[PDB]
Design a protein around this ligand. Structure first.
Ligand code: GNP
Ligand code: MG
Length: 386
């Protein structure tokens, strides 16, 4: 029906993320239609399991006249860390809530830093609790601090929309403050571009199985994550070993012979001139010249706590685990940040990884850290190096 956009509230503790989320749903429901959500319903977030990783997240939905929004709000800072690193709640844009009574605080910086690291494309600021501060000069000083903090982490602070509002007064029904919620939702519509749909990105298929079919020939199976593969087009096989070119001579779903495979479909792709022995676990099919294989990358990782089923023992610089990319494990070595010699369960750090086999990757690729086939961490590629 309507374009779908994924957003969420970030910001320091008690600056009003949950109150803002309730205010958005309530004001939009009475203005444009929809269902309002109360503060208690959003604050009492359910527990979800992405892949051994426990995250507490509330998911609300609301509509502007032209868009439908999926909005995440979390009760704990650790929940935001896990969500942004695992991508369990992906964000086309984030609402940074900064309380005017405090200005930017340590978690304001940390959430902006995580945003840049995991690739949050756009940030909108809601300067909250303005019902408490009447000083115009003080509000201007805080906005300048927020803009410089955003620019410090490469966001466009000078062009960042900043709305001076009161989430509480808007939730309580003050029309003068509800108008600021509508101004915020207006920036959601106008500042966050419509996200690029997967079918319009370069073709990519992670290979999950391989078969020799009748009359020689090789078929690889998997879900088309991005783009379209058409019969006759050339493909590259990227990862694990030297990149090979091949031609797609067929696509099929079950018993149906298709002339193309589209994003989201589970297909089998027939490859010409490729034998079964030339396909390795962890490889992908890709449009030629759109993704490259790499061994070394900078990442942000979360280490599972003991209570989450992770490891009980801390690890040190010689830690040599497996990195699960899409379909398979690849062993790698790590470099810890300067001044960090021990990493506890439950910690999150920047980590430079060197794999023993290249993996087709770019910034934003998610991965799991595993020991003996059991997930002990999750990461995101922040910057490829090799
Ligand atoms: N005066 C005033 N108080 C507000 C406003 N918005 C939120 N508050 C108050 O500030 C407190 C924190 O609200 P909350 O939404 O829970 O903040 P939070 O950032 O979600 N907290 P947490 O980080 O724990 O999830 C509450 O007492 C709330 O009523 C506002 O615009 N004005
Ligand atoms: Mg909250």
């Amino acid at each position: 029906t309507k374009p779908h956009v994924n957003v969420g509230t970030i910001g320091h503790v008690d600056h009003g993320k949950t109150t803002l989320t309730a205010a958005i749903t309530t004001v939009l429901a009475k203005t444009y239609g929809g269902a309002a959500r109360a503060f208690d319903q959003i604050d009492n977030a359910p527990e979800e399991k992405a892949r051994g990783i426990t995250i507490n997240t509330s998911h609300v939905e609301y509509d502007t006249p032209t868009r439908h929004y999926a909005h995440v709000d979390c009760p704990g800072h650790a929940d935001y860390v896990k969500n942004m690193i695992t991508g369990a709640a992906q964000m086309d844009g984030a609402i940074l809530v900064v309380a005017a009574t405090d200005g930017p605080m340590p978690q304001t910086r940390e959430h902006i830093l995580l945003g840049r690291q995991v690739g949050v494309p756009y940030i909108i600021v809601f300067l909250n609790k303005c019902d408490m501060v009447d000083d115009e000069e003080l509000l201007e000083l805080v906005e300048m601090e927020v803009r410089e903090l955003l620019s410090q982490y490469d966001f466009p602070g000078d062009d960042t929309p900043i709305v001076r509002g009161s989430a509480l007064k808007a939730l309580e029904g003050d029309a003068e403050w509800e108008a600021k919620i509508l101004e915020l939702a207006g920036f959601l519509d106008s500042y966050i571009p419509e996200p690029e749909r997967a079918i319009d990105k370069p073709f990519l298929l992670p290979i999950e199985d391989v078969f020799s079919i009748s009359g020689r020939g090789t078929v690889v199976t998997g879900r088309v994550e991005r783009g379209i593969i058409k019969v006759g087009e050339e493909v590259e096989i990227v990862g694990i070993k030297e990149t090979q070119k091949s031609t797609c001579t067929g696509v099929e779903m079950f018993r149906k012979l298709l002339d193309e495979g589209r994003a989201g479909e589970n297909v089998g792709v027939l490859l010409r001139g490729i034998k079964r022995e030339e396909i390795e676990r962890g490889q992908v099919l890709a449009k030629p010249g759109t993704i490259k294989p790499h061994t070394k990358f900078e990442s942000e990782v979360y280490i599972l706590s003991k209570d989450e089923g992770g490891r009980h023992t801390p690890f040190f610089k010689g830690y040599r685990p497996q990195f699960y990319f899409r379909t398979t494990d690849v062993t790698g070595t790590i470099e810890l940040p300067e001044g960090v010699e021990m990493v506890m369960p439950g910690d999150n750090i920047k980590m430079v990884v060197t794999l023993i086999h290249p993996i087709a990757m770019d910034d934003g690729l998610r991965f799991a850290i595993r020991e003996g086939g059991r997930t002990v961490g999750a990461g995101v590629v922040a910057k490829v190096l090799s």
